[model samples]
Target: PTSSEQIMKTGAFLLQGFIQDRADASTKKLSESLRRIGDELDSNMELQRMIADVDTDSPREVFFRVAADMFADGNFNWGRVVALFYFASKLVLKALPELIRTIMGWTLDFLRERLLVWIQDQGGWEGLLSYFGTPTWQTVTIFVAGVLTASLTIWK
Candidate 1:
């Protein structure tokens, strides 16, 4: 069934990679960017404790809680959405290499279920690219393929 759920999942999957790339690049490319925004988010002592105290046994819980808090004000914008993913990318970077799949899975699933509707309202997947202006279709294709191959090799 080609439902909205499936489409949104696909969008979320594509965006996760794009967001990670930007989050990593932000460290080198811009001063007050996604990385810095994520850092500001991290500065919230309660959020820091929530992230730091995440139970490795149930790490997915933190993704949900943090996301809920981010969206609590009921205002959804491209920057906030992208910055949340940037925060998640940092979590993935800092997490154990072996848990990449789990961490990423939780992050994407959270976005798929929680934020996809707002994502749709803001002009869908292309809106994100329009906002940040990175990873042209060609680059995203190559990068996605490379990451898939890397994941296979890493997990093997």
Candidate 2:
């Protein structure tokens, strides 16, 4: 493998840790949004083919370039960031199932290096709650207790 390939392989390890370790409410919401977007992509073959055709041989490069263009507008917001992730997730879903982690590693590496400063300026990952809205205790507690009770039933 090439040097760049090795770097992305290393990134794959880090990306896995990043997700399982950062399991917070915000992360949950992000996952939910990605799932929703994935469904949308599933039913839209035109969109999928349109995106997939951007660069059949160098899809990673195309992903990176599209993300760069999205941020080049000089407007940094969660919507655009989510769109960037959606783009990556879409490609991984439609084309590279086996290379999922490799593509995700590249996406995470791209965000960390290029968008870190803007993310920090926006008030860190915690700021994501504002976009998704803070979880209400009624829903949170009910869900928490529901899981606990279900576990207790299974244990017995």
Candidate 3:
């Protein structure tokens, strides 16, 4: 909060280090070619493929299959696909505000739901004047639940 700029610089430095480390000759040229192929694949199915699913023989799994062949047989060289993945990952992290706002927005709704008992207590929202006067497990539970919900959501 004091210096978002300094934090930005730190993140940039870290990202630069990662980029440099991963941009070896192996991945430097490969990223571009792979990126094009990836783009075409994206056009065909977009984000439909599941990285975690084995039943569909997902694109990522298929890619790994090819990747193994490519790496093992020296059928292809250059390997910056991982670098490109990190670059995209960096973009996702750098665009953190969107993610935060999205999470908070959802949390605000969920917090509302989780605090239902308090919200519906006594005189509805007006009862808050008396409720906060005598704190109980409800107060702590509500807040903790809210934080727990938000974290779980962000983790999702």
Candidate 4:
């Protein structure tokens, strides 16, 4: 098979893994809670205006940072995930200079928590192996192959 075909197969496999690993009920409830907070923020024009007008270094920033930190540090609730993403969107709209920093910081923190959990799994390497046994690896392999083929095709 062509490299393109291999890459496509890999990508399809990875997507299946993503779909299968969706959050549990408790996480969903947490996500819902965060979503409600986001809804409140969205419904209040005054709050939106306030967020827009606030200084980057103001107490509002501190609050936002703290909220994001807590959400990321805790369980993988959909509400909190949505909230953080929404907050990031607001920051982007406001053209904050540190938007990338805030995004990366939050993402890193969340991933760190997940990684720690994975590290503590009793099956250890076997648990990790289960991940690769999923379709995700196929998708990843396809993605890399596609990139390489495209690069070579362009170069030639």
Candidate 5:
């Protein structure tokens, strides 16, 4: 099969995986993302067809040509565009490892350098009694813990 056909097949499988994986969820966020991406693809195909039928010099053609040119020329902040696409793809897959990495990295650094020392000074868990500890850290810790636990459960 052609490369384009192969890509389409892979995309279809990815969409199916997204749907099947989240079939029990009430929100079905992955499936929703897939549907949105499908809609975008459909709109793109329609626009391409319309552009192909229109005169190159037509006023409507100007906008389509410019949009295509911007995309092709790697303009319109491609890094951000690509990042957004990656974010959407990750959402569709329900994969947030990169985000987890960022959060975990920050948490580890903060804990090691600041929280640990403070906790140590206040006798660890006893610190909460005296200082009225920030719930932010507690909440974040629980959240990260839950994510890690869920990830392990899902992987197994």
Candidate 6:
């Protein structure tokens, strides 16, 4: 069973990476009149603006994070799981940045309360094994998906 602590740690680590990655990036291959969007947008003000922006990932992305949790471990319930996560993502989103303190706590707690219940209910640590598939196969799947996403993002 995946512990809330582990998940929280993973989430925090990923969030830190998010902050770091967005903190850097982009320069010039051709250098037309271009702007380094990600590299320059790490300010708290920019984060707030992004959260307010409708056309960004703050909505669908966060929701999908929670929604994916609701669907994990093959435990699907239309009302209980879907109902909670579909909206829970928004709550999750609101709490996310707020938790990015010097110590980091709120979102970890939120994830524990919102996600761990369903995760454990579905089948704690052992059940999660089902999601991994053969390790190599999982890596293969990621490569395939990565290429698919990459290709789609870069249009000619």
Worst 10 residues of 4 by lDDT: 14-23
lDDT for every model?
0.52, 0.52, 0.31, 0.39, 0.33, 0.37
Rank candidates by TM-score, best first: 2, 1, 4, 6, 5, 3
Query: Considering every candidate listed, which one attains the maximal TM-score?
Result: 2
Q: Indicate the residue-level lDDT of 18 in model 6.
A: 39
Stretches of candidate 6 exceeding 4 Å from the true structure: 24-99, 102-104, 121-156
TM-score of 4: 0.33
Q: Which stretches of candidate 5 lie above 4 Å from their native place? A: 1-96, 129-156
Residue 29, candidate 5: C-alpha displacement in angstroms = 32
Give all TM-scores, in the order shown: 0.52, 0.59, 0.21, 0.33, 0.22, 0.31
Candidate 6: RMSD to truth: 13.3
lDDT of 2 by residue, 1-156 (tens): 224443344334434433333225555664554454345434556544555445446667666666666666666766565555556655564454346766676787777677666666656554444655655412332332232223223222
- Please provide, for model 1 over 24-134, each residue's C-alpha lDDT reduced to its tens digit, 9 standing for 90 to 100: 343233323334344445445644454455444455665556566666677776655654565566566545444656666777777777777776775665555555555
- Please, what are the lDDT tens digits per residue for candidate 3 over residues 62-148? 333322332334222112222223323322333334543342333233323333333343333233233333435233333322322
State which candidate, 2 or 5, has the greater TM-score.
Answer: 2
lDDT per residue (tens digit) for residues 23-86 in model 5: 2231244335444433343344432343244333333323223323323443333122212222
Tell me the spans in candidate 4 whose CA falls farther than 4 Å from its real position.
1-43, 58-64, 68-76, 96-102, 114-156
- Per-residue lDDT of 77 in model 6: 32
Look at candidate 4 and tell me the lDDT of residue 21: 28
Residue runs of model 2 more than 4 Å from their true location after superposition: 1-23, 41-46, 134-156
Which candidate, 1 or 2, would have the higher TM-score against the true structure?
2
Give a tens-digit lDDT track for model 4, residues 48-99: 5555554555434543444445434445432233333444445555554365
Error of 2 at 41 (Å): 5.0
After superposition on all C-alphas, the RMSD of every candidate to the true structure, in Å, is 12.3, 14.2, 22.5, 18.0, 20.8, 13.3
- TM for candidate 2 is 0.59
